[PDB]
Amino acid sequence: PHMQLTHQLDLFPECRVTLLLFKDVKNAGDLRRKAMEGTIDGSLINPTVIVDPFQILVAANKAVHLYKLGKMKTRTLSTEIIFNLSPNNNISEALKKFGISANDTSILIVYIEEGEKQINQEYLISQVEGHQVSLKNLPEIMNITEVKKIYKLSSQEESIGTLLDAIICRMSTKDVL
Amino acid sequence: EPAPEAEALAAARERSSRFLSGLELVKQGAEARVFRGRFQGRAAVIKHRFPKGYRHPALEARLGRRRTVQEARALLRCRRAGISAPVVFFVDYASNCLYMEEIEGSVTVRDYIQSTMETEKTPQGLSNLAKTIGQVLARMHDEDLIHGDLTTSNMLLKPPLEQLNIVLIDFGLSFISALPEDKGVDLYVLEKAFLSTHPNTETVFEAFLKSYSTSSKKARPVLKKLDEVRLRG
Numbered sequence: 001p002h003m004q005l006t007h008q009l010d011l012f013p014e015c016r017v018t019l020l021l022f023k024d025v026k027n028a029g030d031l032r033r034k035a036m037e038g039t040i041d042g043s044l045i046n047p048t049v050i051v052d053p054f055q056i057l058v059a060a061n062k063a064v065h066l067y068k069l070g071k072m073k074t075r076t077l078s079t080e081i082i083f084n085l086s087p088n089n090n091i092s093e094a095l096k097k098f099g100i101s102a103n104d105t106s107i108l109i110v111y112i113e114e115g116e117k118q119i120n121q122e123y124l125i126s127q128v129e130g131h132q133v134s135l136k137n138l139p140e141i142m143n144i145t146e147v148k149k150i151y152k153l154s155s156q157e158e159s160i161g162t163l164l165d166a167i168i169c170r171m172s173t174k175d176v177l
Numbered sequence: 178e179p180a181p182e183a184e185a186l187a188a189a190r191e192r193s194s195r196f197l198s199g200l201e202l203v204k205q206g207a208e209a210r211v212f213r214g215r216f217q218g219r220a221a222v223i224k225h226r227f228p229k230g231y232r233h234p235a236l237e238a239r240l241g242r243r244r245t246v247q248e249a250r251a252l253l254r255c256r257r258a259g260i261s262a263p264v265v266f267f268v269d270y271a272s273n274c275l276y277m278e279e280i281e282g283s284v285t286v287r288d289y290i291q292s293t294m295e296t297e298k299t300p301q302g303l304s305n306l307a308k309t310i311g312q313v314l315a316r317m318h319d320e321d322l323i324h325g326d327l328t329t330s331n332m333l334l335k336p337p338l339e340q341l342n343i344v345l346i347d348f349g350l351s352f353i354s355a356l357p358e359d360k361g362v363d364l365y366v367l368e369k370a371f372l373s374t375h376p377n378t379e380t381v382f383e384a385f386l387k388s389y390s391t392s393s394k395k396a397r398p399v400l401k402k403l404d405e406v407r408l409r410g
């Protein structure tokens with residue numbers, strides 16, 4: 001009975017994506033190190049540049065697709081989700097701008113469960129020195145100026161649709177440039 | 178023993194065929210089928226080319242890949258240029274399936290023109306539609322994007338219908354070219370679609386050409402090529 005947001009993947013119905021959002025985080029540096037050591041589950045994502053959960057679900061769908069084909073661009077599923085958010089194919093740049101660093105105070109954790117792979121959510125939440133919030137609070141954490149900066153969203157793109165739609169178009173087609 | 182990579186690819190193609198199996202068909206082209214479904218909470222269409230039965234499997238895969246890649250590239254070019262066209266959600270190159278936004282409740286320009294002609298018996302009321310199409314295709318060609326299949330069936334009107342919200346679709350035969358001849362052939366396919374599908378709408382096409390010429394600074398050599406390709410049939 002909780003603040004998590006979960007969705008099944010339509011194309012992979014045995015996979016469920018979970019989103020957890022946190023504010024006032026005080027141990028982001030420890031969290032980043034634990035992710036690199038593999039002692040925290042999920043992708044740690046910078047919510048300041050996340051406009052909508054659909055953006056995450058598109059990135060997650062693609063990551064699972066290439067995971068099962070064995071054709072990921074990055075090393076792990078958790079890095080692949082983060083990489084897929086970026087508008088371009090520079091892996092190091094993507095993981096640094098859409099991942100978390102020690103001077104972040106808001107974190108979005110995204111993980112995927114399927115089959116025997118189960119996440120201990122209570123333990124995960126206990127690792128974050130911060131306050132979990134409902135994803136309803138994402139619009140006050142996302143920074144529209146930073147989003148347009150990272151994505152080079154343009155005036156002609158905004159004239160015909162949402163920022164989200166232009167972002168999704170960039171994400172979904174960057175693998176054929 | 179089978180290769181794990183090949184086994185994984187077969188499982189992905191099975192997933193795709195299974196997902197498409199229970200969906201409603203919204204469009205049937207020569208090669209392509211378009212189904213409507215849901216993608217992560219959004220109304221979506223999914224476009225795929227099924228093997229026709231008389232061709233080599235490798236040739237079918239090459240064809241599906243080529244047109245899927247071209248369409249994904251064109252739709253990105255459209256969005257970044259402010260040309261209205263469906264958002265791409267996901268492109269599955271294992272199965273050559275394109276998942277994109279459904280333009281919900283829309284009607285084709287073809288159907289809209291035919292309904293107008295059967296209610297009003299006059300094409301006089303289609304002048305605004307023609308001017309809008311002229312502006313839209315001028316912008317597309319000024320981005321050097323050749324649609325490749327420009328008929329009144331590949332333009333949608335997004336509701337509310339009388340706002341004339343044109344949305345371009347079906348870029349599987351598109352390519353990039355600055356050559357006036359390629360742009361001229363593009364317009365020629367559209368002219369033939371007006372002439373054979375919408376008889377007695379020459380004023381409509383005339384107003385289209387007028388608006389296209391106004392809207393694109395590069396229209397003059399394109400319209401000269403349109404004259405030439407018509408002759409060299």
Ligand SMILES: Nc1cccc2c1C(=O)N([C@@H]1CCC(=O)NC1=O)C2=O
Nearest residue numbers: 203204211263279280281282283346
């Ligand atoms: N071939 C494409 C390609 C992209 C998008 C669409 C199509 C397409 O046929 N439609 C119809 C239009 C009429 C409608 O209400 N719903 C649809 O599914 C599309 O939205």
